[PDB]
């Protein structure tokens, strides 16, 4: 439903299960690809936005109709696929 | 296996770098394992040239604006961190380059 | 509507695509021939995307020159050593237009 | 009115003057361009005195070819192996006119 950034490259969902970005792929100026994996990792203090510094990925994601995601910056993303391997969930998104 | 490494790299357009000889380099993918494990693979490809977008237009990004090579084979970026070269090989005319981030002490 | 400003150059980025000194694009529309020694060419302004710059070998032979340039007295010198005269340059419906002629060789 | 006849072949005799097998003088009056693959030229038949044949070297490079050929199915062959199409061939008030076109590969 929603993803909140708790640590750099760490995201907590509506159920507060950590999602760890793994890779960021660029094909064209309008093609930005990022993969997400859900794995429980020891969490630290909430890195306030200033501590995080500049970053390409947004701070927040929220579910949008039509298989799309709206980011904190008002940008929109599309969900390509989502599977479960050996108990670990995977989510892949592409920029719009 | 390329022995002559580039001397400079400037950000001309979002995700496009020009080298000392003005050949457009493109970063293919960014692989991150954790805060201390970051590496980027660069490839050489001739792409159409637009207008030079100003820093305000490029916007915030993970990568540094420009690179620079110091003796002892290390790369220093404008953000004050040191990048170590991993490999640089040529296959059928296409050149691949991978750079690693050294966590500054 | 008459215009009091003129372009000081016209490179040939692509065949039938000219860019003035402010990187605006001009496109030729039609070519007029009245006789052997009279040729009048019509230029129009329009904004279009630009591809890769075709090199001189790719451009090939053509009737128009590769580069104009303004000279005092209000005459253009093409790249083939011939002088071109300015006929008129007006604005209509917000669209820029220009007409040029080929003067007899001195 | 439209005329079925048409020159089989055309050859350039001078600068901006052509001759057909009948040796009628066909001249270009205007050229209309919409893009590289879309190019149009207009022809008219007039009576004029022919000078010495200006050999192609003196004519110099030009957008028009040195020879124009005609084939069935609206197929025209030029000296440079390009193809052209005929749009209309009419006679009005005693003047005969013809229009050509350029077809993308």
């Amino acid at each position: 439903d929603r993803l909140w950034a708790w640590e750099k490259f760490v995201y907590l969902d509506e159920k507060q299960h950590a999602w760890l970005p793994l890779t960021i792929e660029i094909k064209d100026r309008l093609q930005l690809r990022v993969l997400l994996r859900r794995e429980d990792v020891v969490l630290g203090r909430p890195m306030t936005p200033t501590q995080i510094g500049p970053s390409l990925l947004p701070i927040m994601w929220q579910l949008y109709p039509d298989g799309r995601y709206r980011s904190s910056d008002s940008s929109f993303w599309r969900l390509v696929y989502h599977i479960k391997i050996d108990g670990v969930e995977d989510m892949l998104l592409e920029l719009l | 296996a390329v022995t002559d490494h580039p001397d400079r790299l400037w950000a001309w357009e979002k995700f496009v770098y020009l080298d000392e000889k003005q050949h457009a380099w493109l970063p293919l993918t960014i692989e991150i394992k954790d805060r201390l494990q970051l590496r980027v693979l660069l490839r050489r490809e001739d792409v159409v040239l637009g207008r030079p977008m100003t820093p305000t237009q490029i916007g915030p990004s993970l990568l540094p604006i420009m690179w620079q090579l110091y003796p002892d084979g290390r790369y220093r970026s404008s953000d004050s961190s040191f990048w170590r070269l991993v490999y640089h090989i040529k296959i059928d005319g296409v050149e691949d380059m991978l750079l690693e981030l050294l966590p500054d002490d | 509507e008459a215009v009091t400003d003129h372009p000081d150059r016209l490179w040939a980025w692509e065949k039938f695509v000219y860019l003035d000194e402010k990187q605006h694009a001009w496109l030729p529309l039609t070519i007029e021939i009245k006789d052997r020694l009279q040729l009048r060419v019509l230029l129009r302004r329009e904004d279009v995307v630009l591809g890769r710059p075709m090199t001189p070998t790719q451009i090939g032979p053509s009737l128009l020159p590769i580069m104009w340039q303004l000279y005092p007295d209000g005459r253009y010198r093409s790249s083939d050593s011939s002088f071109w005269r300015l006929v008129y340059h007006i604005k209509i419906d917000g669209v820029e237009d220009m007409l040029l002629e080929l003067l007899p060789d001195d | 009115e439209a005329v079925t006849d048409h020159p089989d072949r055309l050859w350039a005799w001078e600068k901006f003057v052509y001759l057909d097998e009948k040796q009628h003088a066909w001249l270009p009056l205007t050229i209309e361009i919409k893009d590289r693959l879309q190019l149009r030229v207009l022809l008219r038949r007039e009576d004029v005195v022919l000078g010495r044949p200006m050999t192609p070297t003196q004519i110099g490079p030009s957008l028009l070819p040195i020879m124009w050929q005609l084939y069935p199915d609206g197929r025209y062959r030029s000296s440079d192996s390009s193809f052209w199409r005929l749009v209309y061939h009419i006679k009005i008030d005693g003047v005969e006119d013809m229009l050509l076109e350029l077809l993308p590969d």
Partner: protein
């Protein structure tokens, strides 16, 4: 330091034209150089002009060396006239205070002040003395004494104590006590040029010489004021002095003075602008008196509602108007004007600046006329020492001197009771008199200015005198100064053009500028442009021209009106190219131009009345100039040469133009050079592709351009085709290695049109030499020339060259230098011994050879049959090698015609051997002066 020697050396050199100056530098270099000079970079010497070259010599070399170096060089070059000249000489308040405050700070100590007249040295000294009196200075100065040559030149012998106490009788009782404290005394000598026991009576000159020599009161402080003319004696008199220079008003102070005098801002600024429009009159405005004259004249004209523009056009008009406006109307004082002219002439000839009542009496000047002479401000009475008089300023004295010469001379005036110290026109215009008395140069310009007719008419109408009509012919009788039969140096041309502009009569200019054949110009400000435009339009046989523009003429790229005036004058000036149809060579170098000026120049160059045949561009800014010039020179029917150099980067537009310049069908080019052009391999590839179509180019130079060897390989792979047309080719200093030599060998073996080559300044290496030699061996090789100057080759390369030459090749010319062949020299000697050799020339300049190896060369020369020229230089075979070579070559009369080597002609035995060889081989010319340090270039090859 001695300012005298620098001034004397500068003036002589500026009389040399371009051709002579180049020889002078070369001859000087061959001269035995002091160790300090050699450290200087030879590049700087070449670029230095006449004035700077003098500065370089004086700041590094001993005085005696300079004197003998100059005289010997000129005598050898056969400039006899200059040799005689060289030998003779070589044998209102709040402003003056502002200047003096900064001047004073630049200062037993010996101080000398020197500067041009009217700059205010006496005010500076008096300000220092007043500061001493007012306790402003340090308290250490307890006593100071004032001595003036203006007065002391007449008083008879006496004692120094009495001399200095003459003006202060009360102090004589304290003179011994004062002089017991010599360390607290300050002495000032004012106006030197106008010229042991303090209680011992002696002549005034003896006392002054002793004090200047510090023979009396040695531990006092001295301060001297003099003009640069009389600075010579102080060198022989003073011991370890220090020199200080004064300058006077500046632009800001001139503006302030104008504001003070006029009062009204509008009037003051209008007048200041009108004055500054004239550079020559502006420079003379530093002296306050000149500004006084200008302000008075312009204000008087303005109050009367008259146009001031013609007044400031030239000096003579201004001074003439002022003089006309300083005497009563209707008097027609012919006699007074003649008297004043004669008095000024006498004063100028005798070099005296002050006159006493007795001097005025001697010339019959009635004291009644002094009322008009003074109240009109022509003469100024000194208020300190009564009975003295002087002229308002030096320039006014010079103007009156000119008025004397142009004034009509009466019959029998040689019968006067005095032998006047007046020369004649020819003596006045002579150069030796100019050097002896530098104050007649300005009289020359003024005299030229008075040759007009309108000014003579106005002067006669206002005063009623009579004017001599023979001046127009007398000036041209010294026309030999102009008919030197050689191009005039820059300074001489400036002087002649300035005088002609002063004349303001075209009929005077035509007869003088008719025979010019070559010209060089160096613009520095607007006035020079205006003068050149006015004068040179009448030339018809002009054939060459070299141009140059200094910074500041054209305003930086962005005031609009200031640049507009310059643009208008530039457009007027650029009509020489269009009108003159005999001009056949141009050159432009080191100019700070601007886009508009370049566009105007090209517009005038593109017309059909111009018949240029060669062109050159070097180090021009901005960087659009090269592109515009390449555009303008397309289709020129006559053009057959073209050069471009500088620092450029190949923008795509430049690539377009530089390819179209060769694609065209009207092209008639025959030689093309490029320099400092950086570009990517793709641009070079397309350029070399375009070359394939050209059917006129024959030469091609690429000096200083970067090929990176990739352009080179592309070029060679282009030349292997069977239909190329280039014949010469030169890749001087293009970052080459041995990698590309294989393709060069392929070109040599396959080509059928290539017949020259050059690779100077490239460490290609012995492997590259080996590849080329493998190339040469093929039977069908047609290359006839080859140059490998300074290519870092070793004895292995020499062995390869000899092995290649051993066969029946077609090579005839070969040039080696810098790179050394000493150890392998015997190998090349063996190669020469081979009957199959066909070499005709061979250069071994600076090859580090030892005398032991002269045997091989001697035997080879005695054996060979086809060699016709050999060049040896910078070798150590000077004495023993000379002996052995001359002894060996005495045996046979070989075909050799020209042999070059360095010798000393002071040895009798060497002279005898040379005479014997010459007698037995009269057809052999031997160059004994190979000491020249300039290498044979690649221009011929």
């Amino acid at each position: 330091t001695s300012p005298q020697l620098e001034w004397t050396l500068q003036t002589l050199l500026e009389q040399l034209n371009e051709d002579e100056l180049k020889s002078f530098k070369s001859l000087l270099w061959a001269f035995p150089l002091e160790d300090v000079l050699q450290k200087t970079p030879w590049s700087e010497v070449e670029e230095a002009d006449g004035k700077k070259l003098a500065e370089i010599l004086v700041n590094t070399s001993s005085e005696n060396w300079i004197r003998n170096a100059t005289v010997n060089i000129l005598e050898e070059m056969n400039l006899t006239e200059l040799c005689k000249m060289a030998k003779a000489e070589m044998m209102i308040d709040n402003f003056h205070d502002d200047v003096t405050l900064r001047n004073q700070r630049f200062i037993p100590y010996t101080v000398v002040l020197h500067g041009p007249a009217g700059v205010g040295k006496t005010t500076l000294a008096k300000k220092c003395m007043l500061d001493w009196t007012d306790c402003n200075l340090s308290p250490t100065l307890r006593y100071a004494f004032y001595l003036s040559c203006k007065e002391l030149s007449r008083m008879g012998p006496c004692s120094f104590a009495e001399l200095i106490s003459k003006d202060w009788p009360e102090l004589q009782d304290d003179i011994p006590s004062i002089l017991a404290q010599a360390q607290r005394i300050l002495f000032v000598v004012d106006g030197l040029d106008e010229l042991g026991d303090w209680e011992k009576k002696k002549p005034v000159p003896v006392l002054l010489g002793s004090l200047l020599k510090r023979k009396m009161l040695p531990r006092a402080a001295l301060l001297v004021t003099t003009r640069p003319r009389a600075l010579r004696d102080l060198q022989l008199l003073a011991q370890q002095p220090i020199y200080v220079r004064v300058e006077g008003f500046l632009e800001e102070d001139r503006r302030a003075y104008f504001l003070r005098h006029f009062g009204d801002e509008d009037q003051a600024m209008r007048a200041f602008e009108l004055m500054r429009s004239n550079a020559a009159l502006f420079q003379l405005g530093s002296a306050p008196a000149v500004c006084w004259i200008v302000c008075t004249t312009l204000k008087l004209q303005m109050e009367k509602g008259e146009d001031p523009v013609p007044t400031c056009l030239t000096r003579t008009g201004l001074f003439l108007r002022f003089l006309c406006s300083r005497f009563p109307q209707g008097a027609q004082l012919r006699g007074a004007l003649r008297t004043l002219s004669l008095l000024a002439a006498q004063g100028l000839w005798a070099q005296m600046s002050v006159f006493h009542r007795e001097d005025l009496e001697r010339l019959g000047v009635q004291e009644s006329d002094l009322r008009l002479f003074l109240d009109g401000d022509i003469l100024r009475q000194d208020r300190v020492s009564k009975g003295c008089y002087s002229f308002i300023h030096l320039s006014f004295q010079q103007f009156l001197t000119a008025l004397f010469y142009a004034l009509e001379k009466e019959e029998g005036e040689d019968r006067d009771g005095h032998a006047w110290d007046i020369g004649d026109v020819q003596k006045l215009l002579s150069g030796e008199e100019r050097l002896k008395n530098p104050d007649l140069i300005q009289v020359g310009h003024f005299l030229f200015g008075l040759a007009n007719e309108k000014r003579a008419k106005e002067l006669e109408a206002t005063f009623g005198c009579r004017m001599s009509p023979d001046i127009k012919q007398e000036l041209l009788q010294c026309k030999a100064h102009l008919h030197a039969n050689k191009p005039l140096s820059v300074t001489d041309l400036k002087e002649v053009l300035g005088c002609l502009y002063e004349s303001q009569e075209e009929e005077l200019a035509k007869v003088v500028v008719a025979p010019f054949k070559e010209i060089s110009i160096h613009l520095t400000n607007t006035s020079e442009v205006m003068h050149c435009s006015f004068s040179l339009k009448h030339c018809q046989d002009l054939q060459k021209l070299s141009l140059q523009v200094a910074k500041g003429v054209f305003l930086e790229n962005y005031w609009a009106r200031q640049d507009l005036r310059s643009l208008r004058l530039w457009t007027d000036f650029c009509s020489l190219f269009s009108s003159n149809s005999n001009l056949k060579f141009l050159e432009v170098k080191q100019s700070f131009l601007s886009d508009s000026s370049v566009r105007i120049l090209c517009d005038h160059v593109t017309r059909s009345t111009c018949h240029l045949q060669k062109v050159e561009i070097k180090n021009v800014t901005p960087d659009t100039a090269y592109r515009d010039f390449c555009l303008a020179f397309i289709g020129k029917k006559t053009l057959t040469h073209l050069t471009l150099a500088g620092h450029i980067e190949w923008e795509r537009t430049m690539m377009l133009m530089l390819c179209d310049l060769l694609r065209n069908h009207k092209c008639n080019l025959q030689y093309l050079r490029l320099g400092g052009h950086c570009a990517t391999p793709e641009q070079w590839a397309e350029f070399f592709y375009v070359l394939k179509a050209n059917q006129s180019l024959k030469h091609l130079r690429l000096s200083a351009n970067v090929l990176l060897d990739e352009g080179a390989m592309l070029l060679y792979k282009t030349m292997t085709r069977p239909k190329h047309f280039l014949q010469m080719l030169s890749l001087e200093n293009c970052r080459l290695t041995e990698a590309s030599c294989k393709d060069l060998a392929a070109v040599l073996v396959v080509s059928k049109k290539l017949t020259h080559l050059c690779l100077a300044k490239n460490p290609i290496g012995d492997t590259g030499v080996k590849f080329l030699c493998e190339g040469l061996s093929y039977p069908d090789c047609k290359l006839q020339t080859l140059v490998l100057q300074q290519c870092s080759i070793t004895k292995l390369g020499c062995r390869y060259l000899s092995e290649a030459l051993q066969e029946a090749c077609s090579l005839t010319n070969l040039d080696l230098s810098i790179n050394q062949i000493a150890r392998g020299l015997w190998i090349l000697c063996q190669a020469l011994e081979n009957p199959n050799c066909n070499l005709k020339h061979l250069r071994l300049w600076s090859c580090s050879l030892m005398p032991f190896y002269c045997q091989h060369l001697g035997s080879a020369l005695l054996s060979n049959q086809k060699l016709e020229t050999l060049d040896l230089g910078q070798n150590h075979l000077w004495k023993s090698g000379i002996i052995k070579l001359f002894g060996v070559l005495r045996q046979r009369t070989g075909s050799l015609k020209i042999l070059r080597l360095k010798t000393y002609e002071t040895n009798l035995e060497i002279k005898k051997l040379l005479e014997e060889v010459k007698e037995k081989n009269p057809k052999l010319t031997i160059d004994c002066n190979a000491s020249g340090a300039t290498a044979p270039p690649c221009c011929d090859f």
